[PDB]
Amino acid sequence: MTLETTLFPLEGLEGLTASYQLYAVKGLSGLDETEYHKNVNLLVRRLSFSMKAPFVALSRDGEQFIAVPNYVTEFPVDHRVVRAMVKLVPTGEPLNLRFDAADDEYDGLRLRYLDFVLQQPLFANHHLWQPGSGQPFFHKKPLKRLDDVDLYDGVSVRAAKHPEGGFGIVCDARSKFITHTPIGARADRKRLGKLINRSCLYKMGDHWYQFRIDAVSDWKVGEPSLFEGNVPISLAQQLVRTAGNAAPKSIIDLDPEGGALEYFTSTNERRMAPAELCFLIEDTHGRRAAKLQRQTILSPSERRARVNGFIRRYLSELNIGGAKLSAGARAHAFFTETHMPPALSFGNGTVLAPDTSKDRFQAMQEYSSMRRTMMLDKKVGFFHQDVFPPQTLLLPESVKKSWGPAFASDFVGTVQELYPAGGYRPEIIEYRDKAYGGGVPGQMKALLEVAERGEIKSGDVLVMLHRINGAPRAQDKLAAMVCNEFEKRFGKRVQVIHSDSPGRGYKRIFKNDKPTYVQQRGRGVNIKGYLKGAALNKVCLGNSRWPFVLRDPLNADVTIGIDVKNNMAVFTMVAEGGRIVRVQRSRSRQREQLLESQVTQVITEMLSKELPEIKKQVQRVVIHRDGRAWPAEIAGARKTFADMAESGLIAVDADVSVFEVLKSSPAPLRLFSFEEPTQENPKGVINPVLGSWLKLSENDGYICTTGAPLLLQGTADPLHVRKAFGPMAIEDALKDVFDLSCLTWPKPDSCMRLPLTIKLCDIALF
């Protein structure tokens, strides 16, 4: 019950002046929304870099408001580029922010100043470096060698509210992989062309930083490519002109014939960097280098050790205006009650409840196992049991002619054993996967023409696609294409599997003097496991046959997940206790953001259909956003529900709350609990228990949706949720985030870090 954080308190901030002066930006007041905030955050960075002061943006009312420190002297007030010229009219009332104070709306302002000053000792340490603004600091010396790629260890350091009052520091260990040798001066023009969009570490003498390769320069390092006052100057000459004092040999003795790269500054200037000084960052999720990935998974005691070691070594001294701000040696620790997993309802009126008489750890593991075994027991089974509507299995022709039939036979039987009530009996159809070209167009040509023939009787289809590109850090545009077209022109609900992984499970055999495909089970896939998993996710879940639901009400009557990536939005809606789940995709006019009118359309459309099956009057709605919530999205959700409270579809005093679900947290914190130290674990640090949680603030909490009994390796990564709007108390949102993440439908005997609401969003996009 004893949990330690990676929160370290900050002392000697006791009544420290932080003085600001609000300005407001007239700009180009046309708000393209996504474009409006790119430029806002563009100017704050440009202004911050040029005057070396903590400029911030405060989005309330007009969403402008750049906060200028009172201590800056000359201030341009007018700023060029940015299309139409911008003007900043000061809003008076200079704010002297205290750090001993209660919660303000200027706490975002206070956290930014605190953030800015905290990285000055770090940015000045010659032995550390930072990839870009806002990122962790890494040691210049690599931790580990790993045979042509280097492993660098870093620590993110972010300011945050302390739940006992005042301010503190949250940290986490990070790893970055960089190839050991540079690109090199001798690498030729064609090889350099092949690196566009990759990112490399640039050791520009003592200033190390990261950039993205945008183009290859027409000019080598020693040929004049720009000018320092009219006169043409080589890149080699430029690095000499901007070196200091005892510049390293490496930056003044560059091969004149080496090539140079070009990149854009975080203010969009173009710069060059010599390939002799550039080191490719190894995207290991792009190229499966898993022995590399293994070096990155740290035990809880390693992770704790690296963070505490870092704290005591680099944030020990910090003089800001003389002030002596110490980071305490003791991370914040507290006693808390841990959420028990919720009672669950299965088929045949059977509930699964955590056993409160066994000890917590043994009870959680029995519980987690029982979600699978109850789901599979023909005596209890799925909560929702019914015949499937007609189904279709759409296979490539090359597959129907080889192992398709054995796979389909095995697959149907797997569905019927997992979900006996369904009577899965799919029509098996094919498309001419070799008639048109095997790229995305051509695969799609054959698919549309099967559709156009009307060969997909039935509204549900499971179609087997070929993998076009691998690289798990890619976009499978074929799958999205098939769903967009099959949903939009025909009435199809489509689920996707690929042909490579099941195909590895079958080998051809000669039996009774006839070729046959039979399962194999050496190395490559576990075909039985694949068959069970695909049966649950593609057939059962794809027909909304939920295996189990919450027995008890969440704090919210309805929670809606929202993710938008790559101009495609997903809305999931969970009501009852997961008894009612709906997922709508919709195209988006911006890459990662939604128009207000679009939010209000999709949600009233989705909810209106479902309201007659929500048999309790609705009075709490929650929205879970993946990442940042945008003001136009909030307006659409408050408008949607204020409307329904007036129609009578919902309680006249219903309320909305908006929470950002930060699967990639901007302020990542760890939680540990403790154990007897034991040879193998000299400090006795273990993962936190499954339901552990911590709030820092009314707006910021963390729940271990993953944790002690149920993790295989590594240390639990607490899910950061941040309150964007609304009455609901942050503690309540964390509790039913936890309860929603116990609906582990894609893999019941496992833990699941995301609540079901936004997990369904990642599934629908991925």
Author numbering: 1 to 766
Please give sentences taken from the publication describing this entry.
Argonaute proteins are programmable nucleases that have defense and regulatory functions in both eukaryotes and prokaryotes. Here, we describe a new class of pAgos that uniquely use DNA guides to process RNA targets. The biochemical and structural analysis of Pseudooceanicola lipolyticus pAgo (PliAgo) reveals an unusual organization of the guide binding pocket that does not rely on divalent cations and the canonical set of contacts for 5’-end interactions. Unconventional interactions of PliAgo with the 5’-phosphate of guide DNA define its new position within pAgo and shift the site of target RNA cleavage in comparison with known Argonautes.
To elucidate the mechanism of guide DNA binding and cleavage site selection by the newly identified D-R pAgos, we determined 3D structures of apo-form PliAgo and of its complex with 5’-phosphorylated guide DNA (P-gDNA, 18 nt long), either in the absence or in the presence of Mg2+. The structure of PliAgo was determined by single wavelength anomalous dispersion (SAD) method with SeMet labeled protein at 3.28 Å resolution followed by extending the final resolution to 3.1 Å with a native crystal. All crystals were formed at nearly identical crystallization conditions and belonged to the same space group, containing one PliAgo or PliAgo-DNA complex per asymmetric unit. A crescent-shaped PliAgo molecule contains the N-terminal-L1-PAZ domains on one side and the L2-MID-PIWI domains on the other side, similar to other eAgos and pAgos such as TtAgo. In contrast, the C-terminal 18–20 residues of PliAgo are disordered in all the structures indicating that the C-terminus is located away from the 5’-end binding pocket and does not interact with guide DNA.
